[PDB]
Amino acid sequence: SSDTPEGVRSGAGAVRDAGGAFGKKEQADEERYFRARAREQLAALKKHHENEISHHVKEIERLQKEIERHKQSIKKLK
């Protein structure tokens, strides 16, 4: 068939357009591999140091408010 212009010839991207067994085995392998790359690129994206400082403080502020509460409690009791 293919050894003439008349007969049917296959192009590029014909395993996914069929939608069979190999067309489903290819979609679940591009997803189960690029799911782990959304893990390693997101875990190392938390290693920004400026965010950790900001978080060094939010916590600090929270703790200082607790201290403020306690100090008021003492004031009352006294």
Partner 1 sequence: FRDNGKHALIIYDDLSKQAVAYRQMSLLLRRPPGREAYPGDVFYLHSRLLERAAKMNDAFGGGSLTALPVIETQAGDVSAYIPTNVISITDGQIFLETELFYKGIRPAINVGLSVSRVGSAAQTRAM
Give the footprint of partner 1 on this chain (CB under 8 A). Answer: 5-7, 11-12
Residue matched to tokens 């190392």: 44
Query: Hey, what are 57's tokens?
Result: 């403080």
Residue matched to tokens 């003492």: 74
Residue matched to tokens 């893990």: 39
